[PDB]
Amino acid sequence: MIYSTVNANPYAWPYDGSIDPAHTALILIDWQIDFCGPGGYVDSMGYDLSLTRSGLEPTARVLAAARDTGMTVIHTREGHRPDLADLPPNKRWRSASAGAEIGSVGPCGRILVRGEPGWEIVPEVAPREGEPIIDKPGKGAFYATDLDLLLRTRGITHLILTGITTDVSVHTTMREANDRGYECLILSDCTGATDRKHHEAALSMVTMQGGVFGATAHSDDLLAALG
Amino acid sequence: MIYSTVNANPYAWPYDGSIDPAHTALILIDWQIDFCGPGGYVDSMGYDLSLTRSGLEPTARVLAAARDTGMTVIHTREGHRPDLADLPPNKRWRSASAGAEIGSVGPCGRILVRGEPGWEIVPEVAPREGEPIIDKPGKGAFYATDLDLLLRTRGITHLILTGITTDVSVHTTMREANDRGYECLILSDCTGATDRKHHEAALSMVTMQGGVFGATAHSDDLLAALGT
Amino acid sequence: IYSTVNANPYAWPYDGSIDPAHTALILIDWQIDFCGPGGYVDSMGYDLSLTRSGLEPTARVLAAARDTGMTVIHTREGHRPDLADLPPNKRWRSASAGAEIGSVGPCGRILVRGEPGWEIVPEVAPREGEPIIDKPGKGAFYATDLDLLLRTRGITHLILTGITTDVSVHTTMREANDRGYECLILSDCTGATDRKHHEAALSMVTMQGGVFGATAHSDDLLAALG
Amino acid sequence: MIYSTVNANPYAWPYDGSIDPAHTALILIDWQIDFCGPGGYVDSMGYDLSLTRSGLEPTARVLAAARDTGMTVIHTREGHRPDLADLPPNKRWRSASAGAEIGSVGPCGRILVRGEPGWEIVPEVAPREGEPIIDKPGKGAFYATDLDLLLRTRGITHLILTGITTDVSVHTTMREANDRGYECLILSDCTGATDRKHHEAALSMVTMQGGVFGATAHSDDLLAALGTTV
């Protein structure tokens, strides 16, 4: 009912020496076809989907352990209002430049638009009632959302991060959370990027200055702490 | 005077195809002894200061052009209130773990405390009157500050980013800006990290997906586009 | 580009004209929960005629904003059906006033997203291209994307309608003003649970040369728009 | 250690049945010459300083009770960077319209500029070390400040509000706090406005809907509760 530290890089996580489920949230970031599925945004830009998809089954196991421990669980979906009123023109222009324009029709509907097949959370990690979903127009889950209000009213102080991609939406969310004083763990095997060297360097960045953004861990080490 | 695009990775920056100094700000991030000087935070943790100091002279040249062209200039200092009311305990404990506890007395005073010698902006990139200084308790310049009010008040839409470190305060500040729709350039030779691989990987991360966080460039290509 | 409005206490806006391309009409919380029988405000026993008098004037201002092509944004106060965005003090006060957020009344669960009492009333129904803000608080900025929507469209100027004058409208004006938005509040397109609070909310705006912006009757805006 | 509720309007404050100093902050809002002093912004606009000053003596006594019980104490100053980079032009234009332009030289230096005599907290409620000061460029204490960071790192859940003016900075701070889930008390005698009717109407707005922004009380009712541990 109170858990020990996780074997983590570069310190035994978290810093206060124990994980309380009543103050800990598992975050699942952007597990959507647009980031890890055929026909979606990342696929249409020519990136290797095996680099993102490897995180899925490890994440499913960590989601069951969080449900079993009564951790809070929060899901994120990167996406835009169908009218695109939350889409900066630079973001739109780059997506067109990369051959996968946000709001344009691809094999999985309108790219990164809320309500579209490619925007949905994949079945492997489907949310259930009582696990709030953040709909974010940005990479960072804090910006232009109610996330911080959801975390503060639940008294959350500790975040465990899974999702995609490691260097983009996961790292942005970790950095925003860290600046607010949240104690964050990132799971090396439940994340993935458009480039394996970016995945590795993003985990590596976390570990400097005695853990500038938190700690990294394998899901095996978290499942071990959770019993 | 408006200027054409910078030769950048992965697109000719900015996306809208001109640089207007009325709408552009040069950001100098955390050029402090604590991040690039003997006796400070980063030195005390045992990292190599030459990795952070190489960006100083190139930054001073970009600062000269930015003041030349009439674009706004904004400076940042990472630091805490002397009473540490703005210091999360996890940030404090990790700094102790690394051998350089925030608030502890080092060779340049209380480490990362506002008012202390190690927290001062180094003279090579000293601020002038009318160039606002951001005091931030975090790595991101937008969290717990007035930066967004300063930028919206001057009508800024475009940021040129310099300072340290590439993968920590610079990247966080770039990520925060980018999500609000600021168009951002990061200068490869005017930034630096506690690790060369982290600096290089931080620059490259920007360039993916057609420029997910904006674009990278050498100060040479910025100074060419400005006609300096 | 349109002329200034005959406003209190200066000719609004401060920069001397209204550009539809930089102006948004905001319609705040026109929901059965705030102005309709069977909703939150009715359940607390407040007088609905105080809130409902602003409706037909708002409809008229909504038509003039649509005709001039300015941005239109609507707000709905409401909570996630799981109530993860509901502070315990807000819930507790609502229970205390005999209309608990989430409790079932004639119009479904009070102040819950998806429920009949939460919907925007038809007299000011939104149309395509008019973004709706879903807010868990009185202020339209807190825990929403409102500021992203406005900044992306280049909005500098807000015209404020909706209910109530002293709660959600005043909070939203105070938030927008502090960010440097130039705000007009329409006296006849707002209403409160108390006439004195309505009038006092409006005069608070007019102090110190217009501390939060300016007040106007919809007639004065429509005269400016014509 | 833990204290009884306050006899407040419209419920015995706070909603969770007791006051814990470990989780409660006293906030002192904008007790500056520019709002309550001769030669300052409000004086230069022609408003009656007796309306703001009356709150000063009861505030000193509440400040004393807060420091005695070991509550957190936070002070705010409304003000602008000397370069005016945080000053929206509509704010400046209204101040010039009202005959007291922000940044302009008056009897107490540059009006509402940080570092100037008019801007200083007045000596009756001077901060001590360990009581953070918030420098805000707006009326609300949360916008473009670290206040939320200070409050959350200290585990503060409950606010007691004093300061000026009741209808501007104090109300705006209260609305911001309340929306984020903070439980707030506004002290009727430790606040004041440019208009008595605005002060009274600012306090009764709080009381509607079972206490839409929190509750109101007299310093006497607060001081009674702080003499009654449970």
Residue numbers in the entry:
A (entry chain B): 1 to 227
B (entry chain C): 1 to 228
C (entry chain A): 2 to 227
D (entry chain D): 1 to 230
Can you quote the paper on this entry?
Biuret hydrolase (BiuH) hydrolyzes biuret to allophanate and is part of the Isochorismatase-like hydrolase (IHL) protein family within the cysteine hydrolase superfamily. TrtA is a member of the isochorismatase-like hydrolase (IHL) protein family, similarly to BiuH, and has a catalytic efficiency (kcat/KM) of 6 x 105 M−1s−1, a KM for triuret of 20 μM, and exquisite substrate specificity. Interestingly, the active sites of TrtA and BiuH are almost identical in sequence, and so it was hypothesized that triuret is the substrate for TrtA, funneling into biuret metabolism.
Mel, which is colocated with a cyanuric acid hydrolase (AtzD) and has no triuret hydrolase in the genome. The KM values for biuret and triuret of this enzyme were more than ten fold higher than for TrtA or BiuH, respectively. The cocrystal with biuret showed similar mode of binding to that of BiuH and identical active site residues. In organisms that contain only one copy of a biuH gene, like the Rhodoccocus sp. Mel species that encodes RhdBiuH, generalist properties may be selected for if they do not possess a trtA gene with specialization of certain BiuHs and TrtAs occurring in genomes encoding both.
